Amino acid sequence: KSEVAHRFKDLGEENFKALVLIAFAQYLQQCPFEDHVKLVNEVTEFAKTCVADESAENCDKSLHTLFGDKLCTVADCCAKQEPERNECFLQHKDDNPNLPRLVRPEVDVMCTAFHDNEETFLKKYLYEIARRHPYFYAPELLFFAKRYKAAFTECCQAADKAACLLPKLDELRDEGKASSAKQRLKCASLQKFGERAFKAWAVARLSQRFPKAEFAEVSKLVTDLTKVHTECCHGDLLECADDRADLAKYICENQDSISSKLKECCEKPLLEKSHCIAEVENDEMPADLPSLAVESKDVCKNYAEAKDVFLGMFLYEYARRHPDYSVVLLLRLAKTYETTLEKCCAAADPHECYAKVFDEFKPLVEEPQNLIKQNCELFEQLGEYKFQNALLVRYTKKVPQVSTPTLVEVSRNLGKVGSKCCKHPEAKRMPCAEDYLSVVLNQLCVLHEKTPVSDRVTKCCTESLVNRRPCFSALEVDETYVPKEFNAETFTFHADICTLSEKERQIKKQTALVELVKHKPKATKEQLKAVMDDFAAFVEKCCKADDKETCFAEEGK
Numbered sequence: 059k060s061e062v063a064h065r066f067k068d069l070g071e072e073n074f075k076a077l078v079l080i081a082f083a084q085y086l087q088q089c090p091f092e093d094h095v096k097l098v099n100e101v102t103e104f105a106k107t108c109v110a111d112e113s114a115e116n117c118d119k120s121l122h123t124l125f126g127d128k129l130c131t132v133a134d135c136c137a138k139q140e141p142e143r144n145e146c147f148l149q150h151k152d153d154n155p156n157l158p159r160l161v162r163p164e165v166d167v168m169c170t171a172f173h174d175n176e177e178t179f180l181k182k183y184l185y186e187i188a189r190r191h192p193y194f195y196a197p198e199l200l201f202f203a204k205r206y207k208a209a210f211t212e213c214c215q216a217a218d219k220a221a222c223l224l225p226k227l228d229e230l231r232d233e234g235k236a237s238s239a240k241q242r243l244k245c246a247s248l249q250k251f252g253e254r255a256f257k258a259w260a261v262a263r264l265s266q267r268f269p270k271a272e273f274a275e276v277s278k279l280v281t282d283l284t285k286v287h288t289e290c291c292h293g294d295l296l297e298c299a300d301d302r303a304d305l306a307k308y309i310c311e312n313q314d315s316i317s318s319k320l321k322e323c324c325e326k327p328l329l330e331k332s333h334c335i336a337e338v339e340n341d342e343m344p345a346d347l348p349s350l351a352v353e354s355k356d357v358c359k360n361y362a363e364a365k366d367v368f369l370g371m372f373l374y375e376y377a378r379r380h381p382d383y384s385v386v387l388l389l390r391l392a393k394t395y396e397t398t399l400e401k402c403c404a405a406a407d408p409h410e411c412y413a414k415v416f417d418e419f420k421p422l423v424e425e426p427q428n429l430i431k432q433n434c435e436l437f438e439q440l441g442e443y444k445f446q447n448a449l450l451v452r453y454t455k456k457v458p459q460v461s462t463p464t465l466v467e468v469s470r471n472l473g474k475v476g477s478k479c480c481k482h483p484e485a486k487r488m489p490c491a492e493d494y495l496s497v498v499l500n501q502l503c504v505l506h507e508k509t510p511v512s513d514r515v516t517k518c519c520t521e522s523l524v525n526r527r528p529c530f531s532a533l534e535v536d537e538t539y540v541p542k543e544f545n546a547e548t549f550t551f552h553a554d555i556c557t558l559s560e561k562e563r564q565i566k567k568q569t570a571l572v573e574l575v576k577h578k579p580k581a582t583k584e585q586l587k588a589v590m591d592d593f594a595a596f597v598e599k600c601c602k603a604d605d606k607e608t609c610f611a612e613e614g615k
C-alpha cells in the first residue's frame with residue numbers, strides 16, 4: 059500500500075529522519091541547512107500520519123512523487139511528469155559543487171556545540187557531507203554518523219580532548235573520502251555500463267571473498283546486492299537502506315552456506331553488522347579444487363542454451379581459486395573466454411579449436427604482475443611524497459589540458475596506493491593495486507566529466523572499465539599542447555602560506571609543480587628539481603625567518 063509508511067515502520071524514526079536529510083542534501087545541494095530540516099520534519103510528521111492509518115490521504119503516492127513536491131518549493135527541474143522530474147535531479151548532481159570549504163574549529167569549541175544542541179550538531183554533519191558528495195553511500199553515512207556521535211560523547215569529558223578527538227576525526231576523514239570515491243565507482247559502473255557489466259563485476263569479487271559458497275547462493279547474493287546500489291545511486295535512499303539492512307539478516311541467517319568469517323561479524327548492532335561484511339576478509343579456498351570442465355563435448359551445448367549462466371559460472375569457478383588476481387584482470391580473462399567461445403563453437407571441430415584457451419591467459423595475467431613490482435621499486439626508493447611528484451610530471455605531460463587542482467588530487471591518491479598496499483607480500487599486490495587504481499581513475503573521470511578540456515581523457519574514461527587502466531598508462535606525451543602564457547599571480551604566494559599546517563604546504567608545492575609544467579612542458583626532469591628546490595627554499599627561508607610580508611612577494615624568475 060503506502061510505501062512511505064512501509065519504510066518508516068522498518069527503518070525507524072531515527073533512520074527515516076536521517077535518510078531524508080541525506081536525500082535532500084544530495085538533490086538540492088545549494089539550499090542552506092535550515093531549509094532542509096523544515097522539509098524533513100514535514101515529511102517525518104507526514105510519515106507518522108500514514109503509519110497510524112494506511113488508508114489516509116496522499117499516502118499511496120510513490121516516494122519520488124512526494125519528494126519532488128517538497129523539493130520544488132524553492133532550476134526548471136519540476137518539468138513534465140514525475141519520472142522526468144526525478145531524473146532531472148540525478149542529472150544535476152554536481153560532483154564538485156564549488157562550495158566553500160570546511161574548516162576544522164578548535165576542540166573545545168566543538169564540544170560546547172555538541173553539548174549545547176547534540177541533535178543539530180549531528181544533523182548538520184549529515185547535511186554538510188551529503189551536499190559535497192551527491193553519490194555518497196546512504197546507509198554507510200549513518201554508520202559514520204554513529205561513530206561521529208560516539209567520538210564526541212567519549213572524548214569531550216576527557217582530560218586531554220585534543221589527544222583523542224583529533225586522532226578519531228583524522229581517521230574518520232580518511233574513511234569517509236575513501237568511501238566517497240569507492241561508492242562513486244559503483245554508481246558510474248551502473249549508469250554508464252548498465253547492470254550487465256556491474257553484475258559480472260560483483261560475481262568476481264564475491265567469489266574471491268566467499269569461495270566455500272555455491273554459485274546458486276552467490277547468484278542470490280549478487281542479484282540482491284546489485285538491487286541495493288541501483289537504488290542508492292538513483293536517490294532511493296529509503297529503499298536502499300532497507301534492503302541492505304535485511305540482507306545482513308539473510309547473510310547471517312545461514313553463515314555456513316555463505317562463508318566462515320561471519321561469527322563475530324554479526325555479533326554487532328544493525329549499523330555495525332552491515333559494515334563488517336562490506337570489508338570482510340576472503341574465506342579460505344576449498345582445497346582439492348579441480349582444473350577445468352573446456353574439454354567436454356557439452357561446452358558449446360551449455361553455452362548456446364544459456365550464455366550468461368555458463369559465462370557466469372566460469373568466472374565464479376575461476377575467481378574462487380584465484381584470490382591473488384584482481385577483478386579487472388579476471389573480467390579481462392572472462393571477456394577473452396567469451397570471444398574464444400563464439401568463434402570456436404560456430405565451426406565444425408570446436409574441441410580442437412578451444413583446446414589451448416587457458417594458454418591465452420598467460421599474457422593477460424603477467425601484464426599487471428610485471429607492472430606492480432616495477433612501479434613499487436621506485437616507490438620504496440623515493441618516498442611517498444617524491445613518488446607523487448614523479449607521478450605529477452608523469453601525468454601533467456600526458457594530459458596538460460586538465461585543470462590544475464584535478465591533477466594534484468588524482469596523483470596524491472595514486473601515490474597513496476603504493477604506501478598502503480605494496481608493503482604486502484606477493485599475494486595481495488595484484489588485487490589491491492588494480493582495485494585501488496580503478497577508484498582513483500574513476501574519481502578523475504567523474505571530476506573531468508563536469509568540465510571536460512582534454513580529449514585523450516574523455517575517450518580513456520568512455521572506454522571499457524576493464525581496459526580503463528591500460529589506456530591511462532601510455533596516453534602519449536601530448537606533443538601538441540601550446541603552453542599557457544606566463545602568469546605571475548599564480549606563482550606568487552602570499553604571506554598566509556605559512557600559517558597552514560605541514561600537510562597543506564605539500565598540496566601548495568604540488569599545485570605549483572603542475573603550474574610550472576603548463577608554462578614550460580619541454581622542461582627536463584632535473585631542470586624541474588632545481589626549480590622546485592629553489593621555490594621551496596625561498597618560501598622556507600623567507601617565512602621561517604622573520605622578514606615582513608614583502609619578502610615573499612618579490613621576483614623569483
Ligand SMILES: CCc1oc2ccccc2c1C(=O)c1cc(Br)c(O)c(Br)c1
Pocket residue numbers: 160161162163168182183186187227228231
Ligand atoms: C563543526 C565540526 C565539524 O562539523 C562538520 C561538518 C561536516 C563535516 C565535518 C565536520 C566537523 C569536524 O569536526 C571536522 C573534522 C575534520 Br578531521 C575535518 O578535516 C573537518 Br574539514 C571537519
Ligand SMILES: CCc1oc2ccccc2c1C(=O)c1cc(Br)c(O)c(Br)c1
Pocket residue numbers: 159160186187190202227230231233234235238
Ligand atoms: C569527521 C569529519 C569528516 O567526516 C567525513 C565523513 C565523510 C567524508 C568526509 C568527512 C570529514 C572531513 O574531514 C571532511 C573534510 C573536507 Br576538506 C571536506 O570537504 C568534507 Br565534505 C569533509
Ligand SMILES: CCc1oc2ccccc2c1C(=O)c1cc(Br)c(O)c(Br)c1
Pocket residue numbers: 244259260263264267283302305332335336337338
Ligand atoms: C565482499 C566485497 C564486495 O565487493 C563488492 C563489489 C561490488 C559490489 C558489492 C561488493 C561487496 C559486498 O559484498 C558488499 C556488501 C555490502 Br552489505 C555493502 O554495503 C557493500 Br558497499 C559491499
Ligand SMILES: CCc1oc2ccccc2c1C(=O)c1cc(Br)c(O)c(Br)c1
Pocket residue numbers: 426429430433434449452472473475476491492495527530531
Ligand atoms: C600506484 C601503484 C600502481 O599500481 C599499479 C598496478 C598496475 C599498473 C600500474 C600501477 C601503479 C602505478 O604506479 C601507476 C603508474 C602510472 Br605512470 C600510471 O599511469 C598508472 Br594508471 C599507475
